[PDB]
Structures are given as structure tokens and as C-alpha cells.
């Protein structure tokens, strides 16, 4: 199909804080993703990282390997260092048939630091944006030469969090660099996903349908909480949840009008004990497919 629907395993077992959902085995996560009806699933920390072993657990379940998160350190390492650092991820993605690599600069990120409030996130100095963008685009060209599209994941607690910083990254990159539009991280960072899509839809190569609970976001700011504290409180949820604040249909309508093809991935990290992953991911898939139909994105 033109539109594929994936999930991310952090709804079961968190990556930034491996104690969240540690009791949930990989087999449980993969069985539940498959039986819910997802076309594929993104990499998680409990996934095998060799082609043969990864196929052995995904192919029997009918699950495609969507992509994998890859950390960047362009602010501390040379471009050639980062090309070597990302080559193993590209080799795995090519062997699994993936078409996309998810990247994000994490050298100075704080989303994985439980003691650092989100307001103390790094802000890249203006004089360093041109060089950083040149490095990101260089990695994008390297991946593109090997058939893989690099999509940059704007993220709370990193140097690319606000709407203005998303525009800046797009301005200082291209043509190969693409944007991973994550609706949840966009709204959390005080941006509007619909407006971001209207500007950059032509450059968007991957979409994460992530919802946010506004009241929890307000708590994070008012009480000066860390990213992981927000996650444990339920800052993120799924499409179709009445407690969510993201309006998905307008975003998907912009995608439909411009002929987006690729993955819609439900990524909603939550405390699995409180927010049952099977229940919420099922609601997300049903609701996201309905929203894609209502926006004209999915014709079938």
C-alpha cells in the first residue's frame, strides 16, 4: 500500500529509561503488535540487531521493520566519524528492506536524563547552525546514495524542539535531508503540527502519530519536571484518545493533498502498568486509520 501503519515498542518497553516496562518481553511486544494489525514496528532496545535474528522474530509475525533510531553526535564528532557510526544501521536497514533511517542529535540532549528539568534543554548557538546543518545533509546524502532516506526527529530536550528550530534545520539542509514529523513532540514543544506540515510536507518522509495530554504538559512546565517524569505521568497518548489534544485529521489532510507515501507510526511511550500497551495501541491504530480515511489519505 501507499500508506503503511506501524507502531513503536516504547509503548511496551521504554528506551530512554529501561526500567519502564522491563517486565514485558520482546515476544509479548511483537505478538501484540502483530495481532493488533500493524504492518510493521520500529526498532527498540530489546530487538535483535542482526539481520537474520531480526527476520526470525518479525517475518513469522508478518511485521515489517519500519526503521531504527540512530543517535547523532555531529556537534562533537567529525562528519566522517558520523558516517562510520551510522553505517551499521544502514546495513541492517538495507537487509531488512527499510527505506528510512531516523536520526537526532543527542550529544547534548537531556531527554534521557531523569534529573534535568526539560527547561534546561540545550539551545544551539546561531553561529553553529550552518555547520551542523551541513553535517546533517552530508549524512543524508551518504544514506541516500545507499537507497536510505534520512528523516530528522525533532525531539523535546534536544537542539531541535521548537517550530522555529524546525524551520532552521530545514533551511540549513536539503535536498536529501527529510523531516520526521512527530505530532506529539511538536505540540509539546509549543508548536502546531498542522502548520509545520503545511510548511514542510514536501520534505516530510516519515510521520509519528503521537498524542499529548495537555494537563500533564502543563504539570511538566509548572513543576519543572524532566522529560522522563512527564512520560511516566502520561504526557503522551495515542490518536483517538479523548484525553489527547492533537488534531490529527488536518495534518493527514495536508499529507493527502501533497501525495504523501510511507509510514504512519503510532509512537506513544507510557507507563505500561498504568496505560496498557495492547489497549492503547489498538485504539491508536483503529482511530488513526479512521482519521486517514476521513482526510482522504487512505483510499481503500
Interface ranges with Mn ion (CB under 5 A): 182, 208, 267
> Considering the complex, what minimum distance in angstroms separates the CB of residue 210 from Mn ion?
6
> Considering the complex, what minimum distance in angstroms separates the CB of residue 256 from Mn ion?
21
CB closer to Mn ion, 43 vs 208: 208
* Per-residue cell: 157: 530536550
CB closer to Mn ion, 138 vs 191: 191
Q: What is the dihedral angle through the alpha carbons of 268, 272, 277, 279, rounded to the nearest 10 degrees?
A: -110
CB closer to Mn ion, 17 vs 267: 267
CB closer to Mn ion, 263 vs 291: 263
Residue nearest to Mn ion (CB): 208
> Considering the complex, what minimum distance in angstroms separates the CB of residue 208 from Mn ion?
4
* Per-residue cell: 110: 537531556
> Considering the complex, what minimum distance in angstroms separates the CB of residue 182 from Mn ion?
4
CB closer to Mn ion, 39 vs 269: 269
CB closer to Mn ion, 138 vs 183: 183
CA angle 104, 110, 113 (to 5 degrees): 125
Rounded CA separation 148/200 (Å): 20
Question: How distant, in Å, are the alpha carbons of 39, 46, 68, 151, 295 from that of 10?
Answer: 17, 10, 12, 19, 27
> Considering the complex, what minimum distance in angstroms separates the CB of residue 70 from Mn ion?
13
Of 239, 231, 241, the closest CA to residue 272 belongs to 231
> Considering the complex, what minimum distance in angstroms separates the CB of residue 127 from Mn ion?
29
CB closer to Mn ion, 32 vs 182: 182
> Considering the complex, what minimum distance in angstroms separates the CB of residue 123 from Mn ion?
21
> Considering the complex, what minimum distance in angstroms separates the CB of residue 289 from Mn ion?
19
CB closer to Mn ion, 180 vs 225: 180
Amino acid at each position: 500500500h501507499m500508506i503503511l501503519y506501524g507502531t513503536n515498542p516504547i509503548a511496551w518497553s521504554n528506551d530512554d529509561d529501561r526500567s519502564l516496562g522491563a517486565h514485558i518481553t520482546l515476544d509479548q511486544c511483537l505478538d501484540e503488535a502483530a495481532k493488533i494489525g500493524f504492518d510493521g514496528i520500529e526498532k527498540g532496545h530489546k530487538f535483535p540487531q542482526e539481520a537474520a535474528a531480526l527476520k526470525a522474530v518479525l517475518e513469522p509475525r508478518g511485521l515489517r521493520y519500519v526503521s531504527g533510531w540512530h543517535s547523532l553526535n555531529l556537534l562533537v564528532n567529525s562528519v566522517e566519524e558520523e558516517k562510520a557510526a551510522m553505517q551499521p544501521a544502514l546495513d541492517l536497514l538495507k537487509a531488512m528492506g527499510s527505506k528510512v533511517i531516523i536520526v537526532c542529535e543527542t550529544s547534548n540532549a537531556i531527554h534521557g536524563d531523569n534529573d534535568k528539568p526539560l527547561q534546561e534543554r540545550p539551545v544551539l548557538e546561531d553561529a553553529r547552525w550552518e555547520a551542523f546543518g551541513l553535517g546533517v545533509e552530508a549524512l543524508a546524502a551518504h544514506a541516500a546514495a545507499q537507497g536510505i532516506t534520512l528523516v530528522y526527529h525533532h525531539h523535546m530536550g534536544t537542539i531541535v524542539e521548537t517550530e522555529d528550530e524546525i524551520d532552521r534545520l530545514m533551511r540549513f539542509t536539503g535536498p536529501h535531508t527529510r523531516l520526521l514529523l512527530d505530532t506529539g513532540h511538536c505540540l509539546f514543544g509549543r508548536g502546531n503540527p498542522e502548520r509545520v506540515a503545511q510548511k514542510h510536507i514536501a520534505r516530510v518522509g516519515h510521520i509519528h502519530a503521537k498524542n499529548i495530554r495537555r494537563d500533564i504538559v502543563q504539570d511538566v512546565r509548572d513543576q519543572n519536571l524532566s522529560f522522563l517524569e512527564g512520560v511516566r505521568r502520561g504526557v503522551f497518548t495515542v490518536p483517538g484518545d479523548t484525553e489527547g489534544s492533537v488534531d490529527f485529521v488536518p495534518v493527514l489532510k495536508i499529507a493527502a493533498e501533497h501525495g504523501y507515501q510511507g509510514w504512519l507510526v503510532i509512537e506513544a511511550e507510557q507507563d505500561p502498568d498504568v496505560r496498557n500497551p495492547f489497549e492503547y495501541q489498538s485504539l491508536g491504530l483503529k482511530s488513526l486509520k479512521a482519521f486517514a480515511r476521513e482526510a482522504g489519505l487512505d483510499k481503500g
